[PDB]
Design a protein around this motif. Structure first.
Motif, PDB file in Angstrom:
ATOM      1  N   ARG A   1       3.965  -5.569 -11.426  1.00 41.05           N
ATOM      2  CA  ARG A   1       3.513  -4.543 -12.361  1.00 41.05           C
ATOM      3  C   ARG A   1       2.106  -4.871 -12.854  1.00 41.05           C
ATOM      4  NH1 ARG A   1       7.088  -5.226 -15.539  1.00 41.05           N
ATOM      5  NH2 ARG A   1       8.687  -3.641 -15.088  1.00 41.05           N
ATOM      6  N   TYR A   2       1.154  -3.960 -12.645  1.00 42.33           N
ATOM      7  CA  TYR A   2      -0.224  -4.233 -13.070  1.00 42.33           C
ATOM      8  C   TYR A   2      -0.572  -3.509 -14.366  1.00 42.33           C
ATOM      9  CZ  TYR A   2      -1.432   0.338 -10.926  1.00 42.33           C
ATOM     10  OH  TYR A   2      -1.484   1.678 -10.577  1.00 42.33           O
ATOM     11  N   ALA A   3       0.270  -2.565 -14.764  1.00 44.35           N
ATOM     12  CA  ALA A   3       0.026  -1.809 -15.983  1.00 44.35           C
ATOM     13  C   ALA A   3       1.263  -1.055 -16.415  1.00 44.35           C
ATOM     14  CB  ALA A   3      -1.140  -0.840 -15.787  1.00 44.35           C
ATOM     15  N   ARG A   4       1.259  -0.596 -17.657  1.00 45.93           N
ATOM     16  CA  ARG A   4       2.272   0.342 -18.112  1.00 45.93           C
ATOM     17  C   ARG A   4       1.573   1.557 -18.711  1.00 45.93           C
ATOM     18  NH1 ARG A   4       5.582  -3.751 -21.599  1.00 45.93           N
ATOM     19  NH2 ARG A   4       5.335  -4.704 -19.527  1.00 45.93           N
ATOM     20  N   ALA A   5       2.282   2.678 -18.769  1.00 43.93           N
ATOM     21  CA  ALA A   5       1.693   3.898 -19.308  1.00 43.93           C
ATOM     22  C   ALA A   5       2.745   4.851 -19.836  1.00 43.93           C
ATOM     23  CB  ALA A   5       0.849   4.592 -18.245  1.00 43.93           C
TER      24      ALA A   5
ATOM     25  N   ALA B   1       8.935 -11.871  -7.846  1.00 42.26           N
ATOM     26  CA  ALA B   1       8.378 -10.593  -7.400  1.00 42.26           C
ATOM     27  C   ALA B   1       8.582 -10.430  -5.894  1.00 42.26           C
ATOM     28  CB  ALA B   1       6.899 -10.491  -7.762  1.00 42.26           C
ATOM     29  N   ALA B   2       9.768  -9.959  -5.517  1.00 42.06           N
ATOM     30  CA  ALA B   2      10.134  -9.828  -4.105  1.00 42.06           C
ATOM     31  C   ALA B   2      10.848  -8.510  -3.821  1.00 42.06           C
ATOM     32  CB  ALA B   2      10.998 -10.992  -3.676  1.00 42.06           C
ATOM     33  N   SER B   3      10.756  -7.579  -4.762  1.00 38.58           N
ATOM     34  CA  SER B   3      11.380  -6.270  -4.607  1.00 38.58           C
ATOM     35  C   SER B   3      10.358  -5.169  -4.861  1.00 38.58           C
ATOM     36  CB  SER B   3      12.560  -6.116  -5.569  1.00 38.58           C
ATOM     37  OG  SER B   3      13.569  -7.078  -5.306  1.00 38.58           O
ATOM     38  N   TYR B   4      10.238  -4.225  -3.932  1.00 38.14           N
ATOM     39  CA  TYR B   4       9.317  -3.103  -4.129  1.00 38.14           C
ATOM     40  C   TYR B   4       9.649  -2.403  -5.436  1.00 38.14           C
ATOM     41  CZ  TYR B   4       7.626  -3.484   0.697  1.00 38.14           C
ATOM     42  OH  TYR B   4       7.093  -3.926   1.884  1.00 38.14           O
ATOM     43  N   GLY B   5       8.631  -2.113  -6.237  1.00 40.09           N
ATOM     44  CA  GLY B   5       8.857  -1.504  -7.533  1.00 40.09           C
ATOM     45  C   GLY B   5       9.130  -0.019  -7.421  1.00 40.09           C
ATOM     46  N   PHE B   6       9.438   0.617  -8.550  1.00 41.65           N
ATOM     47  CA  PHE B   6       9.632   2.060  -8.593  1.00 41.65           C
ATOM     48  C   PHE B   6       8.395   2.802  -8.084  1.00 41.65           C
ATOM     49  CE2 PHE B   6      12.715   1.114 -12.178  1.00 41.65           C
ATOM     50  CZ  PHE B   6      13.841   1.497 -11.476  1.00 41.65           C
ATOM     51  N   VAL B   7       8.608   3.927  -7.409  1.00 40.37           N
ATOM     52  CA  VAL B   7       7.502   4.783  -7.023  1.00 40.37           C
ATOM     53  C   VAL B   7       7.460   6.002  -7.954  1.00 40.37           C
ATOM     54  CG1 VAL B   7       7.780   3.976  -4.668  1.00 40.37           C
ATOM     55  CG2 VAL B   7       8.750   6.170  -5.358  1.00 40.37           C
ATOM     56  N   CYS B   8       6.369   6.755  -7.909  1.00 43.14           N
ATOM     57  CA  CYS B   8       6.139   7.805  -8.893  1.00 43.14           C
ATOM     58  C   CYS B   8       6.993   9.039  -8.635  1.00 43.14           C
ATOM     59  CB  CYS B   8       4.655   8.188  -8.911  1.00 43.14           C
ATOM     60  SG  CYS B   8       4.210   9.414 -10.145  1.00 43.14           S
TER      61      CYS B   8
ATOM     62  N   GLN C   1      12.541   6.703  -7.848  1.00 45.87           N
ATOM     63  CA  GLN C   1      11.421   7.197  -8.637  1.00 45.87           C
ATOM     64  C   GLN C   1      11.592   6.900 -10.129  1.00 45.87           C
ATOM     65  OE1 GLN C   1      10.914  11.435  -7.437  1.00 45.87           O
ATOM     66  NE2 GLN C   1      11.946  10.830  -5.541  1.00 45.87           N
ATOM     67  N   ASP C   2      10.515   6.477 -10.774  1.00 44.32           N
ATOM     68  CA  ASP C   2      10.541   6.173 -12.196  1.00 44.32           C
ATOM     69  C   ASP C   2       9.104   6.184 -12.675  1.00 44.32           C
ATOM     70  OD1 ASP C   2      10.675   4.202 -14.718  1.00 44.32           O
ATOM     71  OD2 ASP C   2      12.721   4.839 -14.282  1.00 44.32           O
ATOM     72  N   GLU C   3       8.877   6.512 -13.940  1.00 42.28           N
ATOM     73  CA  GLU C   3       7.508   6.535 -14.432  1.00 42.28           C
ATOM     74  C   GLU C   3       6.968   5.121 -14.697  1.00 42.28           C
ATOM     75  OE1 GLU C   3       6.666   9.775 -17.281  1.00 42.28           O
ATOM     76  OE2 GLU C   3       8.696  10.455 -16.745  1.00 42.28           O
ATOM     77  N   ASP C   4       7.843   4.125 -14.612  1.00 43.69           N
ATOM     78  CA  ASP C   4       7.400   2.731 -14.592  1.00 43.69           C
ATOM     79  C   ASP C   4       7.088   2.354 -13.145  1.00 43.69           C
ATOM     80  OD1 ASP C   4       6.851   0.049 -15.043  1.00 43.69           O
ATOM     81  OD2 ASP C   4       8.923  -0.507 -15.503  1.00 43.69           O
ATOM     82  N   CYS C   5       6.016   2.936 -12.616  1.00 44.19           N
ATOM     83  CA  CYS C   5       5.699   2.826 -11.195  1.00 44.19           C
ATOM     84  C   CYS C   5       4.357   2.159 -10.911  1.00 44.19           C
ATOM     85  CB  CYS C   5       5.703   4.214 -10.563  1.00 44.19           C
ATOM     86  SG  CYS C   5       4.554   5.328 -11.402  1.00 44.19           S
ATOM     87  N   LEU C   6       3.680   1.684 -11.950  1.00 45.82           N
ATOM     88  CA  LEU C   6       2.357   1.112 -11.746  1.00 45.82           C
ATOM     89  C   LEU C   6       2.463  -0.326 -11.262  1.00 45.82           C
ATOM     90  CD1 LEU C   6       0.761   2.503 -15.018  1.00 45.82           C
ATOM     91  CD2 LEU C   6       0.785   3.584 -12.733  1.00 45.82           C
ATOM     92  N   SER C   7       2.777  -0.491  -9.980  1.00 43.33           N
ATOM     93  CA  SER C   7       2.905  -1.823  -9.401  1.00 43.33           C
ATOM     94  C   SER C   7       2.203  -1.911  -8.048  1.00 43.33           C
ATOM     95  CB  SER C   7       4.382  -2.207  -9.255  1.00 43.33           C
ATOM     96  OG  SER C   7       4.968  -1.557  -8.136  1.00 43.33           O
ATOM     97  N   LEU C   8       2.003  -3.135  -7.565  1.00 47.82           N
ATOM     98  CA  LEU C   8       1.384  -3.339  -6.263  1.00 47.82           C
ATOM     99  C   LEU C   8       2.094  -4.428  -5.443  1.00 47.82           C
ATOM    100  CD1 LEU C   8      -0.392  -6.183  -6.778  1.00 47.82           C
ATOM    101  CD2 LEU C   8      -1.924  -4.544  -7.931  1.00 47.82           C
ATOM    102  N   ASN C   9       1.759  -4.503  -4.163  1.00 53.89           N
ATOM    103  CA  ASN C   9       2.353  -5.477  -3.263  1.00 53.89           C
ATOM    104  C   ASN C   9       1.261  -6.272  -2.568  1.00 53.89           C
ATOM    105  OD1 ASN C   9       4.875  -3.785  -3.679  1.00 53.89           O
ATOM    106  ND2 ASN C   9       3.639  -2.377  -2.410  1.00 53.89           N
TER     107      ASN C   9
END
Lengths: 501, 501
Positions: free
Chosen positions: B34-38, B56-63, B84-92
């Motif tokens: 997670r690089y940010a929240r909004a 950190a080994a699981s793809y995060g939620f997408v938008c 899908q979830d609005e907590d989606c600001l993540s990277l791999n």
């Protein structure tokens, strides 16, 4: 450079029409083949015939779900997801030949996820390429209706909704009927179909054994971590209180029950999600599990296996540390025996010393730490299943997967960890790869499954002599670094375990 | 078996806390960082600090998305989907080393899907392993807010919703800052970050070049089929009519606007899907695109490239038959020269013979059939981008992917078909595999990219001399079975094409 072909491939003729797929590394692959259509809360019907050649190379819609998944342990179980739609009755096929004379065994996979979630592709390890290639069998993986779409009794609101309590099960039967009519066109043997499934999938399988409409549509069964007794209770009782609650939440009058067919799924699910827990707290029916009726008899050990079910040879399994998904609160490889003894003594009311001795006998090669993650949820009910089926005259083999993994200091085998091995897909699940260890065990388990569906006998040169289990004597094939077959081996272990908690 | 490690792998420390990843086939992999929240309709802020080591080994939620995908061409573009979830600001992240001194080039991938769909994993080919391994680069793939969550102006309804018109872009800036602050710990060079994207991701990239707050956060850009002009118009104008319509549809009062932040996304999306069409017809703003303001200046060719934008070297591309996704109504390789001449003359108003001449001059190796699938949508605007940027003092390399594929009788290159080649991922997209052709071209294009990010010069021994394009001399690298560089080579073709419709 990987092998791919499309254009000059043979067209496949199904009863309803012509299909084409692709070929990849020698394997013929078809995806999203519709096997039936179904209106909401109603029995599935055959698809309509089409003209021309239809491409089947894309995974079909998966069944809509009540909640959003939250994957946070993808190292343990790598998942896949897909767009949701009620046109979700499709299946995918992997085969080595489209010659109708090939007649290879057919492996029919029913995914788990209780009866509410999951799909034919929901685990990366559900991919059929390797199983098809290494075993020369035809692999069919299937979608069917889940949660309130597949398991909600609306029959008190008209014979239009006859069988809606087990619609999801009726779908799988529809898929099996499609296989009977069409699997020859994919090089499969319609007279040699094995249904296999894990967790919820195992429960769907054991259910189909007890479902007369499905008699003769499959000839073997395999149930993986799929018997759990009163810890995943099936929902029984009058459905009207739930439906009446849902109609009110949706602003519908009781004579407008027909409107429930076409209410947007989001709203339907929202209404169910809000009102069902109060119903559950009242001991009432909330669906989302099978429910005994004329269609589905109930489970063998509880109501008696049907005469036909007795004729279905079965392989059944569990894994050592099923629901111990969370991290152990210490380093298993460094904890001292003194610390462990205190932990055991506190957890098991002072019976740590006896529990270790008994555990040493049951599991000689294991560290005593593994007492803390030992499964007693699935193992108990699965043994009862083996015993009950054998007593009924059935033919049943039993295994327990006990491999420890290169993760969090020899984590014991968790729920779904055996799926990669059975599918010959350890390459698709990183955590299962262990030098000089995993390749061997994967072949051992996989070759056993293949022998099982080719001859009815899983025995082969790489594993110890594995007899059928009998009423008074379970023979458990322990799949591990060193495979052994043991007899009634954890009887007292479980007895002592439960007595001490 | 394949190489896997987890235990005792180096812990990486970021500003907010400590992370743990895994190792697969020698590559270090982290997922769902997670690089940010909004909050909805608000700018991104930094995540909350944590104690201990988080895995950190699981793809995060997408938008969340407005509509549900209907994937029916998976041979053309293999997709993946995710909860899908609005907590989606993540990277791999993929990396060959966690040594802070490695200082390898960073590849920052921004997905397409217009500005409304897609994710860091939405194509199988977005996986970073091979690019990281074969290029020895650190690959970063990112999610950000899309459709109405990332591009919807809520400025007139308060100050808490400032910059909401381009929140999706602000997310990407926040992600770039995360890479600035932390990519050393993954063996990356924050002073050598290349941002690359395709289609909508290409547009996000060209938008970021025109975004002063992003200045210095990247040093190079690659745009793939990502300039399209007035075929995907950005949405501008007064946003009040749209908002007022949604309020009304949601039964919200003119100053219940704060509820838009907390209404279920489903209702919010359904309201938008209902009201926005009529608003679009009346020429009104409906968002879901970037919107020129003080944050983002606008596209270079239209508003003038920022001084900083001119310092960013750019590789740009399109493919031969971009939106020619559907099949040709005939066999491309069977059709007679007589039958083709008719079709050509029907479609191009009698200019068939002239077009064949011009086309044979532009594309000497190609059947005149490919005239029917030639792209004009992306190619023209792309050429204008290349010219405008070069005119302003920028360094731009241009290419055109023209490979023909073993599918539907040598189907011309379609939108996204070059993505697997750029990522060294043809092994993940079956249709791209061609004996003795695809491996060679994959390498040519891949090494071109690696050289481009390593030195600023894509030239290497495997490919023809590739000159920068100038203000009056478009130099197009044509990636095909036989690669060639051509000069101003399809101007006359596109012009003739245009008038004959």
């Amino acid at each position: 450079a990987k092998q791919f072909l499309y254009d000059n491939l043979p067209v496949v003729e199904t009863k309803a029409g012509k299909l084409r797929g692709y070929q990849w590394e020698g394997t013929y692959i078809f995806k999203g083949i519709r096997y039936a259509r179904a209106n909401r809360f109603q029995l599935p019907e055959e698809v309509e015939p089409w003209e021309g050649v239809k491409e089947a190379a894309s995974y079909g819609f998966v069944c809509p779900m009540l909640t959003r998944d939250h994957p946070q342990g993808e190292l343990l179980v790598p998942h896949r997801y897909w767009p949701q739609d009620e046109d979700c009755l499709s299946l995918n096929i992997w085969s080595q030949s489209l010659d109708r004379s090939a007649k290879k065994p057919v492996m029919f996979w029913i995914h788990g996820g209780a009866f509410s979630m999951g799909s034919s592709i929901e685990q990366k390890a559900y991919n059929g390429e390797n199983m098809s290639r290494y075993g020369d069998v035809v692999v069919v993986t299937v979608n069917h209706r889940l949660n309130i779409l597949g398991y909600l009794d609306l029959s008190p609101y008209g014979e239009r909704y006859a069988g809606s309590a087990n619609a999801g099960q009726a779908d799988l039967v529809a898929a099996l009927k499609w296989v009977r009519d069409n699997i020859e066109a994919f090089g499969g043997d319609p007279d040699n179909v094995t249904i296999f499934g894990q967790s919820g999938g195992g429960m769907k399988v054991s259910g189909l054994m007890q479902t007369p409409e499905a008699d003769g549509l499959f000839h073997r069964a395999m149930i993986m971590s799929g018997v759990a007794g009163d810890v995943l209770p099936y929902s029984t009782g009058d459905s009207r209180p739930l439906i009446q609650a849902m109609l009110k939440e949706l602003g519908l009058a009781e004579q407008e029950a027909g409107r429930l067919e076409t209410v947007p799924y989001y709203d339907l699910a929202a209404a169910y999600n809000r009102v069902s827990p109060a119903i559950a707290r009242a001991g009432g029916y909330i669906g989302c599990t099978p429910r005994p009726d004329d269609f589905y008899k109930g489970e063998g050990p509880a109501v008696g296996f049907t005469d036909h079910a007795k004729t279905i040879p079965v392989m059944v399994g569990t894994v050592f540390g099923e629901f111990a998904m969370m991290p152990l609160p210490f380093n298993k490889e460094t904890i001292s025996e003194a610390e462990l003894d205190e932990i055991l003594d506190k957890r098991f009311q002072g019976h740590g010393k006896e529990l270790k001795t008994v555990f040493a006998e049951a599991y000689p090669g294991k560290s005593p730490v593994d007492l803390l993650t030992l499964d007693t949820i699935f193992r108990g009910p699965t043994k009862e299943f083996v015993r009950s089926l054998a007593a009924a005259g059935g033919s049943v083999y039993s295994y327990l997967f006990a491999l420890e993994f290169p993760y969090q200091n020899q984590k014991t085998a968790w729920h779904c960890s055996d799926i990669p091995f059975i599918f010959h897909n350890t390459e698709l699940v990183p955590v299962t790869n262990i030098p000089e260890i995993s390749d061997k065990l994967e072949k051992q388990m996989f070759d056993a499954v293949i022998h099982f569906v080719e001859t009815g006998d899983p025995n082969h040169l790489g594993i110890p002599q594995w007899p059928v289990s009998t009423e008074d004597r379970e023979a458990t094939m322990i799949f591990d670094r060193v495979c052994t077959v043991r007899f009634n081996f954890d009887d007292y272990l479980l007895e002592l375990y439960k007595k001490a908690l």
